[PDB]
Amino acid sequence: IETVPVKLKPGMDGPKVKQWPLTEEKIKALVEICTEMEKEGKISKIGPENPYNTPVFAIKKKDSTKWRKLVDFRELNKRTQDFWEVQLGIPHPAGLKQKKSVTVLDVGDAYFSVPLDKDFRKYTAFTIPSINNETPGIRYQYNVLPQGWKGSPAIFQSSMTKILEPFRKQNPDIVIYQYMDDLYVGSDLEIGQHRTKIEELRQHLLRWGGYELHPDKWTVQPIVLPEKDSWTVNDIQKLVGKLNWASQIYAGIKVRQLSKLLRGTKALTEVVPLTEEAELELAENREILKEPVHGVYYDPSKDLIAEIQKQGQGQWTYQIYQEPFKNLKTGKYARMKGAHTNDVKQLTEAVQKIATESIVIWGKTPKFKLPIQKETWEAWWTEYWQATWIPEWEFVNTPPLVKLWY
Amino acid sequence: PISPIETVPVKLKPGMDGPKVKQWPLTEEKIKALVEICTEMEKEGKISKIGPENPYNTPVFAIKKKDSTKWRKLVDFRELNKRTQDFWEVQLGIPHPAGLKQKKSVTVLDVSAAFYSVPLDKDFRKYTAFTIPSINNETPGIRYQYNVLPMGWKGSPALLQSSMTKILEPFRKQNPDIVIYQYMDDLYVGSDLEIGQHRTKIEELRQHLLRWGFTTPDKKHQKEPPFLWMGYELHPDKWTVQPIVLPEKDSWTVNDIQKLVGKLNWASQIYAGIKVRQLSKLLRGTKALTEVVPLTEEAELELAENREILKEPVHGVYYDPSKDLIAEIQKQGQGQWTYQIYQEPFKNLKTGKYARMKGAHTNDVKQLTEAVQKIATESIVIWGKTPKFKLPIQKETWEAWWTEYWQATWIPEWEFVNTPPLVKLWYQLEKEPIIGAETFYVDGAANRETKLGKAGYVTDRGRQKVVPLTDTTNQKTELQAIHLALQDSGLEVNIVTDSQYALGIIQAQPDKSESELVSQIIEQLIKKEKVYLAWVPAHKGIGGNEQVDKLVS
DNA sequence: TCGCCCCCCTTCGGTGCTTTGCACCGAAGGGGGGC
Ligand SMILES: C=C1[C@H](COP(=O)(O)OP(=O)(O)OP(=O)(O)O)[C@@H](O)C[C@@H]1n1cnc2c(=O)nc(N)[nH]c21
Ligand SMILES: [Mg+2]
């Protein structure tokens, strides 16, 4: 084969990101994986005269107990040329979110049969560390389409359509969406008749080279106001500040007549009887909260953002938007490990589920705003990561003023 | 001899040419020592004469060696380094003796003149051009270039490491049960072979290094304990640091104090309880390294405490993979922590300390979480796993923290251990307002241009107060308003502010702060019995908040 | 009058916020130690 010419974006240099420490089991796994890859010519040993580097680590899944090597090419992807500017990018199908059940398959290995442009390989270097720094790091670069590089699905694009044709041929209403190294494959078949055709796809994929998702239950959780029939000054203050915030999202919500029920310098536990003009305002704004907002539409030229709040008892609320206060989706993720004693696990799993939903719904992951200290996240997240992709994220520290989403 | 290893190609940064800088004066002893190496270097092909077509130049010097007889040559390549391509450094960290296992037979070897046995890219040599001056000006200099890795060049350490790795790998794969710690040219070689076969393996390794041009002189071939290694001393059953000598001085400069704190930090890996908070405070707000700084009374005490700790003999032990690692932390005060890592009681693998202040406002529970994180990372680096923790915090306390704090947080498997002072929450905010307690509506405003402001309150019991403030900010006046309400209320209070800022700081339950004003608020929160803290949006005419807002106006 | 790596402590400067200072963060200064 002859390679495709690839470029970084104008004025950008390749990645230069330090390797972080790894446990014994992950270092041994990487050493086993890479030496086999080196023997098959998929990677090459390089030295320190290549000035580029990207962190590497490994994950092992809940029901495939072999290690998967994972290279965090987030920085490399950010600097790589667009492939819709070369228009070899993949289109997202609006059918996938409508399906009964969607199974994720890791088809990363198909990339290893296509060589990478000789002049772009240096940008793909990574370094395996050493327990107790017994040796210097050991460095490799790829000779083929790397797992995790955004250009690999685009270059391999024309070929996956060829390998897929007979399947989508024979099953015209199964929908298959490539995202990075993953195939998202949905159908309306019964819970276990769907599974067997997933096995059929595996065999056709094998002839050359997670769990079941249910999009119907991805219930949206809207803003809700409490129901009491005794209401204190404090109850009405917390309700007025909550709707005042929601006035930035919705239209025609007002507070001045719930607002004057508290006129005067009152005690926070005094019980204010509700005006009929207050019940006028309240049952009114309840129903605006009841249905979605009008005028919010997805725009593919802009990025997706996701915000998460810890609510406790293992509940986690989230919003996905592109423009502030124009949420494309609000929701609530629920823990289920059973021990229910680990916030970092719950949050890491919530990020995977939210990002999964974005791929199914819009075709790409959002940039997360994570309610956690950077260094707490960094100490523990990889122990819980199970996806072959990694989303962009930043770290935020905003206390709740309102418990808007609860 | 020079290795027949292939050279690693090296480039200048794009656009740049090589250095062109004239040479300076050195002493007579320096010229003779340098000429002996220079004439010998040319004899062994380390350098070659050049002349005037080569337009580049760089200046040269020498420095004394810990082996007192020898002299070490260095050329000042600061300019060439600036123009040389970036390298990805492969030395990721420093091996630690607590990460060694017990070994039956141990050897330590050193490669002599290691840089000078690794050849340099042919096309790159012309940029290493230099001149040797002999005295002041009897002659000008003769010109040489390097055929090998020069000392002082940005790329030399990495091309030595890469070269050493290539030469060692055959021997490593052929003897998987021989530990080789490779740091620069220093080789630690341990094994569970009887001394007879062990020494067969060593000479076999040494003869492999010599074929590739790395000689190992007997002078630096250690074969009996105690081995000198990486600044430590390795015995069969234990290890020590080489002696740490602290400055003792009548009058201290900033630079002196900086050297002392560095020594103490080095000592902390094996001496438990070391503290540097009061000595480092003296470095703050200073302006010259030669400025004399008098020790405060607190810094004298802390110094004396450390000096008592250092007069005691200490040792670490080696790692037993068949046992768990255990990490215990104690609290020392003013944001300082110390820790020990061990496998059997009273037999420390190592110690250390954590004492960073992260943020302007924090509490002991956050900092304890940070110390845990530092220890977890350190254990991964040295042993490849995290330890089990023994922590002076009750499960009730931690559980109160991660349910009332809004950020995700965690600590791994840990056992409570009762070593006061315990880590505590110093107050908790009520989740509901308090019946019978007074209700304060607080607010403060400042004028951004003016820098003048007021803080005040109104209450459900009919109380009011306005205080003028000078040289303040918007955020300070809000903090001040909360200060006043805590000051004039009883042991139980309900407070309503319109400052998301102030609510945000206080809801995180801080117990220390870089701000004297926030610290004052903290002491008042600790003295209260119950406090409920509520927010409302400003300027929406809300009962209470609107009355005070107007009062502050 | 040198190079490369790790660590700590202090300082400084850039970024972003429904900001007008404030809090965060990384880099660069000093020190320790290694070869
Ligand atoms: C680690 C190093 C090798 C092994 O250091 P080394 O102690 O084993 O010295 P070397 O093998 O050369 O001589 P020896 O083993 O015969 O005694 C040396 O090549 C050079 C390098 N190094 C050490 N210190 C310095 C220094 O300050 N400035 C520079 N630029 N480089 C230095
Ligand atoms: Mg040597």
Q: Which domains does chain A have, with CATH numbers?
A: 5-94+120-160 (3.10.10.10), 95-119+161-212 (3.30.70.270), 213-298 (3.30.70.270), 299-405 (3.30.70.270)
Element containing residue A175 per DSSP (H, E): strand A175-179
- Return the exposure string of A83-113: e unless at least 16 CB atoms fall within 10 Å of the residue's CB, then b: beeeebebebeeebbebbbbbbbebbebbbe
**Of B111, B156, B182, B218, best ligand 1 pocket probe by most atoms within 8 Å of the beta carbon:** B111
Q: What residue ranges of chain B are covered by domains with CATH 3.30.70.270?
A: 91-115+157-225, 226-319, 320-426
Q: Are B439 and A400 inside 8 Å of each other by CB?
A: no
Nearest residue to B366 (alpha-carbon basis) of B410, B328, B333, B396: B410
Q: Are B96 and A53 inside 8 Å of each other by CB?
A: no
- Determine whether B302 is exposed, middle or buried from the number of CB atoms within 10 Å of its CB (0-12, 13-18, 19+): buried
Which residues are CB-contacts of A87 (< 8 A; sequence separation ≥ 6)?
Answer: none
Which structure tokens are listed for B415?
């056992």
Beta strands B512-513 and B361-362: pairing type? antiparallel
Q: What residue ranges of chain B are covered by domains with CATH 3.30.420.10?
A: 427-552
Contact B471, B451 (CB under 8 A): yes
Residue B62: which nucleotide is closest by CA–C1'?
A: C2
As a whole number of angstroms, the distance between CA B297 and CA A175 comes to 75
Which structure tokens are listed for B381?
């680096």
Q: Are B179 and A259 inside 8 Å of each other by CB?
A: no
Residue B257: which nucleotide is closest by CA–C1'?
A: C31
Which structure tokens are listed for B494?
């309900």
- Backbone conformation region of residue B102, classed left if phi is above 0, alpha if psi is from -120 to 50, else beta: beta
Query: CB of residue A373 closer than 7 A to nucleic acid strand C?
Result: yes
As a whole number of angstroms, the distance between CA B506 and CA B479 comes to 10
Indicate the fold that domain B427-552 takes in CATH.
Nucleotidyltransferase; domain 5 (3.30.420)
As a whole number of angstroms, the distance between CA B3 and CA B332 comes to 54
Q: Are A49 and B9 inside 8 Å of each other by CB?
A: yes
As a whole number of angstroms, the distance between CA B10 and CA B148 comes to 13
**Which nucleotides in chain C lie closer than 7 A to a protein CB?**
1-11, 18-26, 30-35
Beta strands B47-50 and B227-229: pairing type? unpaired
Nearest residue to B108 (alpha-carbon basis) of B208, B224, B194, B196: B224
Which residues are CB-contacts of B528 (< 8 A; sequence separation ≥ 6)?
Answer: B427, B486, B489, B491, B492, B493
Nearest residue to B498 (alpha-carbon basis) of B462, B459, B544, B463: B544
Q: Which residues 82-111 on B are within 7 A of strand C at the CB atom?
A: 89, 91-94, 110
Which amino acid belongs to residue B451? K
As a whole number of angstroms, the distance between CA A382 and CA A379 comes to 8
Query: CB of residue B280 closer than 7 A to nucleic acid strand C?
Result: yes
Element containing residue B207 per DSSP (H, E): helix B195-211
Angle between helices B195-211 and B156-174 (to 10 degrees): 130
Which structure tokens are listed for B374?
């530092």
- Residues β-bridged to residue A131: none
As a whole number of angstroms, the distance between CA B361 and CA B365 comes to 12
B408 closest CB neighbour out of A16, A270, A344: A344
**HEC-encoded secondary structure of B34-51:** HHHHHHHHHHCCCEEEEC
Protein residue whose Cα sits closest to atom 26 of ligand 1: B151
Using alpha carbons only, give the angle B252, B256, B261 rounded to the nearest 5 degrees. 115
The nearest alpha carbon in chain A to B463 belongs to A265
The nearest alpha carbon in chain B to A244 belongs to B537
CATH class belonging to B1-90+116-156: alpha beta
A51 at interface of B, judged by CB pairs closer than 8 A = yes
Contact A7, A69 (CB under 8 A): no
User: How far is CA B132 from each of CA A184, B50, B78, B139, B539, rounded to the nearest angstrom?
Assistant: 69, 12, 18, 10, 79
Contact A396, A377 (CB under 8 A): no
Q: Does CATH place domain B91-115+157-225 in 3.30.70.270?
A: yes
Nearest residue to A386 (alpha-carbon basis) of A341, A356, A342: A356
As a whole number of angstroms, the distance between CA B13 and CA B17 comes to 8
Pocket of ligand 1 (CB under 6 A): B 67, 74, 110-115, 151-152, 184-185
Protein residue whose Cα sits closest to atom 5 of ligand 1: B185
A310 at interface of B, judged by CB pairs closer than 8 A = yes
What is the Å distance from ligand 2's center to B162 Cα? Answer: 16
Q: What is the DSSP string of B152-195?
A: T-TTHHHHHHHHHHHHHHHHHHH-TTEEEEEETTEEEEEESS-H
- Return the exposure string of B213-240: e unless at least 16 CB atoms fall within 10 Å of the residue's CB, then b: bbebeeebebeeeebebbebbbeeeebb
Q: Are A48 and B94 inside 8 Å of each other by CB?
A: no
- Residues β-bridged to residue A394: A369
CATH H superfamily, domain B226-319: Reverse transcriptase/Diguanylate cyclase domain (3.30.70.270)
CATH H superfamily, domain B320-426: Reverse transcriptase/Diguanylate cyclase domain (3.30.70.270)
Residue A299 annotated as lining a ligand binding site: no
Nearest residue to B152 (alpha-carbon basis) of B116, B117, B110: B116
As a whole number of angstroms, the distance between CA A197 and CA A203 comes to 10
As a whole number of angstroms, the distance between CA B10 and CA B154 comes to 11
Resolution in A: 2.6
As a whole number of angstroms, the distance between CA B146 and CA B46 comes to 6
As a whole number of angstroms, the distance between CA B39 and CA B34 comes to 9
Give ion ligand 2 contacts, CB < 5 A: B 110-112, 114, 185
